[PDB]
Amino acid sequence: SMQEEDTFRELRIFLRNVTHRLAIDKRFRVFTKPVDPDEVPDYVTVIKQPMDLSSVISKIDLHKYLTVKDYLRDIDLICSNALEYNPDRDPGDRLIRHRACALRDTAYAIIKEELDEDFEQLCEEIQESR
Ligand SMILES: CC(=O)c1nc(NC(=O)[C@@H](C)N)sc1-c1cccc(O)c1
Ligand SMILES: CC(=O)c1nc(NC(=O)[C@@H](C)N)sc1-c1cccc(O)c1
Predict the structure, then answer these.
(1) What is the DSSP string of 13-71?
(2) Under DSSP, is residue 107 helix (H, G, I), strand (E, B) or coil?
(3) In angstroms, rounded to a whole number, what is the distance separating the alpha carbons of residues 103 and 28?
(4) Does ligand 2 lie within 6 Å of residue 76's CB atom?
Protein backbone atom coordinates (compact mmCIF):
# COMPACT_ATOMS: atom_id res chain seq x y z
CA SER A 1 0.00 0.00 0.00
CA MET A 2 0.98 3.65 -0.31
CA GLN A 3 1.17 4.03 3.48
CA GLU A 4 3.51 1.03 3.69
CA GLU A 5 5.77 2.51 1.02
CA ASP A 6 5.88 5.75 3.03
CA THR A 7 6.98 3.70 6.04
CA PHE A 8 9.80 2.05 4.12
CA ARG A 9 10.91 5.41 2.70
CA GLU A 10 11.23 6.81 6.23
CA LEU A 11 13.26 3.73 7.17
CA ARG A 12 15.64 4.33 4.24
CA ILE A 13 16.09 8.00 5.20
CA PHE A 14 16.92 6.91 8.76
CA LEU A 15 19.37 4.23 7.61
CA ARG A 16 21.17 6.59 5.22
CA ASN A 17 21.59 9.07 8.08
CA VAL A 18 23.03 6.44 10.47
CA THR A 19 25.33 5.07 7.77
CA HIS A 20 26.60 8.53 6.86
CA ARG A 21 27.45 9.24 10.49
CA LEU A 22 29.44 6.00 10.67
CA ALA A 23 31.20 6.60 7.36
CA ILE A 24 32.50 10.07 8.26
CA ASP A 25 33.96 8.88 11.58
CA LYS A 26 37.75 8.73 11.17
CA ARG A 27 37.92 5.51 13.23
CA PHE A 28 35.84 3.66 10.65
CA ARG A 29 37.70 4.70 7.49
CA VAL A 30 38.89 1.12 6.93
CA PHE A 31 35.26 -0.02 6.71
CA THR A 32 34.10 2.57 4.16
CA LYS A 33 35.08 0.84 0.89
CA PRO A 34 35.27 -2.76 -0.33
CA VAL A 35 38.59 -4.45 0.39
CA ASP A 36 40.82 -4.23 -2.68
CA PRO A 37 42.48 -7.57 -3.58
CA ASP A 38 45.63 -5.82 -4.82
CA GLU A 39 46.15 -4.12 -1.44
CA VAL A 40 45.05 -7.12 0.67
CA PRO A 41 45.71 -10.25 -1.43
CA ASP A 42 44.79 -12.92 1.14
CA TYR A 43 41.45 -11.33 2.11
CA VAL A 44 39.29 -13.49 -0.16
CA THR A 45 40.85 -16.62 1.36
CA VAL A 46 39.42 -15.70 4.76
CA ILE A 47 36.27 -13.66 4.09
CA LYS A 48 33.46 -15.34 2.18
CA GLN A 49 30.78 -12.59 2.31
CA PRO A 50 32.46 -9.15 2.19
CA MET A 51 30.60 -6.11 3.41
CA ASP A 52 31.44 -2.43 3.84
CA LEU A 53 29.65 0.85 4.43
CA SER A 54 29.56 1.84 0.74
CA SER A 55 27.92 -1.50 -0.06
CA VAL A 56 25.39 -0.86 2.71
CA ILE A 57 24.44 2.47 1.10
CA SER A 58 23.98 0.71 -2.24
CA LYS A 59 21.69 -1.83 -0.59
CA ILE A 60 19.58 0.90 1.05
CA ASP A 61 19.01 2.48 -2.37
CA LEU A 62 18.11 -0.90 -3.88
CA HIS A 63 15.41 -1.25 -1.17
CA LYS A 64 17.07 -4.33 0.33
CA TYR A 65 16.41 -3.34 3.98
CA LEU A 66 12.80 -3.50 5.13
CA THR A 67 13.63 -3.50 8.87
CA VAL A 68 16.44 -2.15 11.02
CA LYS A 69 17.13 -5.77 12.00
CA ASP A 70 18.10 -6.54 8.39
CA TYR A 71 20.37 -3.48 8.33
CA LEU A 72 22.07 -4.46 11.59
CA ARG A 73 22.79 -7.93 10.18
CA ASP A 74 25.04 -6.23 7.62
CA ILE A 75 26.65 -3.95 10.23
CA ASP A 76 27.31 -7.08 12.28
CA LEU A 77 28.84 -8.73 9.18
CA ILE A 78 31.25 -5.81 8.70
CA CYS A 79 32.34 -6.32 12.30
CA SER A 80 32.50 -10.12 12.29
CA ASN A 81 34.50 -10.10 9.02
CA ALA A 82 37.03 -7.74 10.60
CA LEU A 83 37.35 -9.94 13.69
CA GLU A 84 37.82 -13.05 11.53
CA TYR A 85 40.48 -11.45 9.31
CA ASN A 86 42.30 -9.98 12.35
CA PRO A 87 42.60 -12.78 14.92
CA ASP A 88 46.26 -12.38 15.93
CA ARG A 89 47.75 -10.63 18.94
CA ASP A 90 49.74 -8.24 16.70
CA PRO A 91 48.92 -4.54 17.19
CA GLY A 92 47.71 -4.12 13.60
CA ASP A 93 45.12 -6.85 14.22
CA ARG A 94 44.16 -5.51 17.64
CA LEU A 95 43.66 -1.98 16.26
CA ILE A 96 41.25 -3.20 13.58
CA ARG A 97 39.36 -5.37 16.09
CA HIS A 98 38.96 -2.38 18.41
CA ARG A 99 37.60 -0.25 15.56
CA ALA A 100 35.26 -3.01 14.41
CA CYS A 101 33.80 -3.40 17.90
CA ALA A 102 33.42 0.38 18.10
CA LEU A 103 31.58 0.46 14.76
CA ARG A 104 29.15 -2.21 15.98
CA ASP A 105 28.65 -0.58 19.38
CA THR A 106 28.17 2.87 17.87
CA ALA A 107 25.57 1.70 15.35
CA TYR A 108 23.61 -0.17 18.02
CA ALA A 109 23.76 2.83 20.37
CA ILE A 110 22.49 5.27 17.72
CA ILE A 111 19.63 2.93 16.87
CA LYS A 112 18.74 2.26 20.51
CA GLU A 113 18.43 5.99 21.14
CA GLU A 114 16.96 7.28 17.88
CA LEU A 115 14.77 4.52 16.40
CA ASP A 116 11.25 4.42 17.83
CA GLU A 117 10.35 0.88 18.90
CA ASP A 118 6.85 1.18 17.43
CA PHE A 119 8.31 2.27 14.10
CA GLU A 120 10.54 -0.79 13.96
CA GLN A 121 7.58 -2.96 15.00
CA LEU A 122 5.51 -1.58 12.12
CA CYS A 123 8.30 -2.33 9.65
CA GLU A 124 8.57 -5.89 10.96
CA GLU A 125 4.81 -6.44 10.75
CA ILE A 126 4.69 -5.21 7.14
CA GLN A 127 7.62 -7.50 6.30
CA GLU A 128 5.94 -10.54 7.91
CA SER A 129 2.81 -9.88 5.82
CA ARG A 130 4.72 -10.21 2.53
C1 LIG B 1 39.03 -3.87 7.32
C2 LIG B 1 40.05 -5.00 7.58
O3 LIG B 1 39.63 -6.07 8.03
C4 LIG B 1 41.38 -4.75 7.48
N5 LIG B 1 42.18 -5.52 8.27
C6 LIG B 1 43.49 -5.27 8.21
N7 LIG B 1 44.43 -5.96 8.89
C8 LIG B 1 45.75 -5.74 8.68
O9 LIG B 1 46.24 -4.87 7.96
C10 LIG B 1 46.72 -6.63 9.44
C11 LIG B 1 47.60 -5.73 10.31
N12 LIG B 1 46.00 -7.67 10.20
S13 LIG B 1 43.72 -4.03 7.14
C14 LIG B 1 42.09 -3.83 6.76
C15 LIG B 1 41.77 -2.89 5.85
C16 LIG B 1 40.88 -3.15 4.81
C17 LIG B 1 40.58 -2.17 3.86
C18 LIG B 1 41.19 -0.92 3.92
C19 LIG B 1 42.10 -0.66 4.94
O20 LIG B 1 42.70 0.56 5.00
C21 LIG B 1 42.40 -1.64 5.89
C1 LIG C 1 16.64 -3.72 15.82
C2 LIG C 1 16.66 -4.71 16.97
O3 LIG C 1 16.09 -5.80 16.88
C4 LIG C 1 17.42 -4.37 18.00
N5 LIG C 1 18.45 -5.18 18.31
C6 LIG C 1 19.16 -4.77 19.36
N7 LIG C 1 20.23 -5.42 19.83
C8 LIG C 1 20.43 -5.54 21.16
O9 LIG C 1 19.69 -5.11 22.03
C10 LIG C 1 21.71 -6.30 21.53
C11 LIG C 1 22.03 -7.35 20.46
N12 LIG C 1 22.82 -5.35 21.67
S13 LIG C 1 18.52 -3.34 19.91
C14 LIG C 1 17.31 -3.27 18.78
C15 LIG C 1 16.41 -2.26 18.77
C16 LIG C 1 16.86 -0.96 18.99
C17 LIG C 1 15.97 0.12 18.99
C18 LIG C 1 14.61 -0.10 18.81
C19 LIG C 1 14.15 -1.40 18.61
O20 LIG C 1 12.82 -1.62 18.43
C21 LIG C 1 15.04 -2.47 18.60
Answers:
(1) HHHHHHHHHHHTSGGGGGGSSPPPTTTSTTHHHH-SS---HHHHHHHHHTT--SSHHHH
(2) helix
(3) 7
(4) no
CATH numbers and ranges of domains, the chain: 1-130 (1.20.920.10)
Shortest-distance Cα residue to atom 2 of ligand 1 = 82
Measured CA to CA, the distance from residue 49 to residue 16 in angstroms comes to 22
Declared resolution, Å: 1.7
Solved using: X-ray
Pocket test for ligand 1, best of 86, 88, 99 (most atoms within 8 A of CB): 86
CA distance 99 to 9: 30
